[PDB]
């Protein structure tokens, strides 16, 4: 890898600079380099990894949606035939997105998840695994689509099982996992009732535990609780 000659600490330093400069492709490359040094990541370092790739893949997903919408209108009744270009360029963006997802899943499999023994790190990485299989599922159409969906489900479920046993209901990782697994149910698994039930139960159980928290923990937890509520409002 092109980052093999840079110090781990220098990679982390430059990832933070890239974030400040909104250079998220660079940030992701720096953090990939840091993961490949082979040491476990701290909480702050896990957050840098997540932020970098979330921004990269988020932009790809937005672009894919623009192009997929144009392509679908191109195939409506009365649309003028315009050649292969829209499909080709949608496929180009799609292939780049799949490549990023495969890269992230590769980092989790080699070897972040297997070395993660603490509940907070293990749940964080398994949530990420669910998330990046979910992004692969958003664009999947072939023989392995159901298996891609189940790979997302299985990662999220393992993360949920650990988080329920080992973390309080207000823990931001537990909350963000539940938020995203709820979206998985609604948008990927065609299970809106499960999505709504999960979001509501997560919100209510967190509400009942807020009284245990400091002001700073309360701010962290209620931020994600508001995202649960926002989704419930969209869906009901």
């Amino acid at each position: 890898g092109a980052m093999g000659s840079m110090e781990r600490a220098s990679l982390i330093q430059k990832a933070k600079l890239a974030e400040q400069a909104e250079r998220y492709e660079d940030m992701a490359a720096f953090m990939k380099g840091a993961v490949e040094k082979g040491e476990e990541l701290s909480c702050e370092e896990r957050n840098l990894l997540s932020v970098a790739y979330k921004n990269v893949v988020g932009g790809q997903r937005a672009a894919w949606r623009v192009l997929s919408s144009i392509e679908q209108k191109s195939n409506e009744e009365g649309s003028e035939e315009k050649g292969p270009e829209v499909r080709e360029y949608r496929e180009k963006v799609e292939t780049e997105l799949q490549g990023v997802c495969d890269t992230v899943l590769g980092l989790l499999d080699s070897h972040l998840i297997k070395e993660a023994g603490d509940a907070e790190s293990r749940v964080f990485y398994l949530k990420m695994k669910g998330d990046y299989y979910r992004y692969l599922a958003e664009v999947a159409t072939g023989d392995d689509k159901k298996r891609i969906i189940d790979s997302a489900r299985s990662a999220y479920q393992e993360a949920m099982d650990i988080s329920k046993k080992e973390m309080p209901p207000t823990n931001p990782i537990r909350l963000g996992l539940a938020l995203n697994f709820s979206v998985f149910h609604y948008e990927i698994a065609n299970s809106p009732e499960e999505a709504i039930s999960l979001a509501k139960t997560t919100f209510d159980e967190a509400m009942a535990d807020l009284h245990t928290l400091s002001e700073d923990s309360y701010k962290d937890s209620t931020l994600i609780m508001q995202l649960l509520r926002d989704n419930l409002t969209l869906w009901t």
Binding site: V183, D230, L234, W235
Partner: peptide, 5 residues
């Protein structure tokens, strides 16, 4: 689009 983190 629903919220995810």
């Amino acid at each position: 689009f629903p919220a995810t983190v």
